[PDB]
Swiss-Prot record, chains A, B:
Organism: Streptococcus dysgalactiae subsp. equisimilis
Name the UniProt record assigns to this protein: Streptokinase C
Annotated function: This protein is not a protease, but it activates plasminogen by complexing with it. As a potential virulence factor, it is thought to prevent the formation of effective fibrin barriers around the site of infection, thereby contributing to the invasiveness of the cells.
Alphabetically ordered keywords of this record: Plasminogen activation, Signal, Virulence
Gene name linked to the record: skc
GO-annotated cellular components: extracellular region
Amino acid sequence: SVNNSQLVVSVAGTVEGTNQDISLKFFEIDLTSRPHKLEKADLLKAIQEQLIANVHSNDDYFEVIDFASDATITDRNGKVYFADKDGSVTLPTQPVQEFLLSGHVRVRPYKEKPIQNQAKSVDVEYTVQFTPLNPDDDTKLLKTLAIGDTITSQELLAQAQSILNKTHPGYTIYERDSSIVTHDNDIFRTILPMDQEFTYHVKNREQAEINNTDLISEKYYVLKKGEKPYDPFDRSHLKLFTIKYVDVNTNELLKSEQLLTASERNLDFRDLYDPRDKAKLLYNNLDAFGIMDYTLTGKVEDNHDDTNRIITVYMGKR
Amino acid sequence: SVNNSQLVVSVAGTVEGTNQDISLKFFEIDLTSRPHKLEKADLLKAIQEQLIANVHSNDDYFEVIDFASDATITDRNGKVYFADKDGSVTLPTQPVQEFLLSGHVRVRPYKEKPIQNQAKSVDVEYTVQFTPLNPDDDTKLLKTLAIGDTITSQELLAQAQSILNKTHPGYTIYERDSSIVTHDNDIFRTILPMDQEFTYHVKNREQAEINNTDLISEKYYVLKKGEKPYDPFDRSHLKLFTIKYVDVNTNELLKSEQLLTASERNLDFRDLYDPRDKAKLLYNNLDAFGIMDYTLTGKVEDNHDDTNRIITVYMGKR
C-alpha cells in the first residue's frame, strides 16, 4: 500500500449501560510529515465521524466517550506507544510501516444535554436537490424562527415546488427522497421522516449580537409532468430475442437462449473479457458453456420477424 | 476499460514540407452524454495540448494546422463516421464501445506571424517556487515594460533572493532549476536557458484595448545557509551491515550479504511482498534466493561491533 506510514485505527465501541459491542469499520490515518504526533482528542474525533458514517435513522447515533483500558497503539513488533500529558502520541514516521490502534472505545446513544446559554433565534436555511424519475436531462434563506417554532413537509413541499418552476417548469415533485437538518455544523444532524408527513420544531442550542442557524437539505424526485416511471415492472419496452448458435459445418444447434433487451442496438457481438459487451447479445466463443473452440463465423441469419426475432449466429471450429 | 464509450485519438503528425512523421501519444476522450457531438476544433485543440506536453526545448514546439484527408473515426466494425459542415461529428455513444480516430494531422514548427495590431505595454509578472536541496522543511508583479525591453537572470535572481529572505531567511538560492514566460495564455510559452545566465527581451503580441501581460514562473533550489546537498557521491553517512542467515538446526550459513543503509532504523525484517519493507535489511523468506522453506526463527545475534556490524539471522524450515 501507500509507501508512507499510516495508522490503522481498528476499534469497537462498548456501550454505556449495556456492554454491547458496536462494530466500527477500520480506517487508516496518514502519518505524513510532522516522527509525527497525534492528539488523543483528534483520534477520538476521527472515531466519532466514522461512527456517524452512514446513519439512516436518528437513534442510530452513538457518542464516543473515551478509550477503554483496551486501546493501544502498536508497531509491527509489539512495541506499545503511549500518551503523554498532552494526551498526544508521538510515532516514528520514518522506519516506515503501519501502526495499529486496537482496543475498545466507550460509547453511548446520542443524548444531548440541556442548553445552559440558550440561543436567541435560528435563521432557517434551505437548499434542495432534484433528480429525474427516468430518462431525461435535469439554496437560500427564509423563516428566521426561534427555538420552539416548527415547519412542515407541506411548506417545505411548497418552497420546493416554488423553485421547481423557478428553474425547469412543466416538471413536478413526484416524491420526497431524503430530508435532513444541520444545526450549525453540529455533527449530529436531524434526519427527518422519509415517506410520510412531519413537522420539525427547530431544536435548541447554545447562543453562538448575532444568531444561530439551521439548514434544511432536501431531495425530491421530479417528473416532466404527465409522464411515468422507468422499469417499475415493465417488459413492454424490452425486445425479446432468441439466439441460435449453430455449427456452420454440421448445422447442429450448439446452444440457444432468449433475452429481453432495452434496445436493438445491442444486437452485436460480445467479448467475455470486455465489460462494455455486457448488453451485447451475440457471443463468439461459447466456452462459458462448455462448448469448446467455436469461433464467430461472422455470419448471422436475422429472420427479421419483429414479432418472432430469431437470430442464427453461425459458429465453426478453430 | 471505463465502462463508457470513449474516442481513441491515435494520430501522427506530418510536418509541412519535410513530410516527416512526428509521433504523438494517443489519449482517450470520454464520450459522456451529449449520441455525443464533437467539434473539429475541440479535437484539434486536444491534440494540440498533447503535442506540447512536456516540450523541453523552445524549438520542440509544433503548430497544429488541421487534419489530413487521412483522419478517420471508426467503430469496431469499420463503419466510418463523417463530419458535417459544422465540421462536428455525432457518434452513437449508446451501444457502448470505443471508436477510433486515426490518420494524420498537419503541423509545422512553431513559427509565429507578425503582430499587426501591436500591443501597448506588457506588465511583467513574477511568481517563484522554492525547494530544499536536502533534508529539511521549506507571486506578484513588477517592471511594466513594453516590447523590446529586457530582463536578466540577475534581476530575477534578485527578486528571487529578496523574496527568499522575505519568507524564510537564513536560506540561499543554491541554483536555478526552471524558468518559463507565459505571454497572455499563449499556449506556446517561452522556455529560458536552463543552466546559464540570459536576457529575455519581452516578446510581442497583438494589443489585448487594454494592456497586455507577461508572467515569469521560476523555480530555484535553496540551501539552509551553511550547508551542502544530499547524497551527491557520499557513502560516509551510510552504514555498512553484514547479515548472515543461518539455519537454526545445522548452523549452516545459508546466505549472507552486505548492504549500506541510511539509517539503523532499517534493521528490521522485510516482507518481500510488502513495498514498504524495501529499505529493510532482514529478509525472512529466503525463497527469493533459491533457499526454500525457511522462516525467521525470530532470533537474531547482533555482534554490536559498530565498526563491523555483523548480524546473524536464524532461519528455520517449516
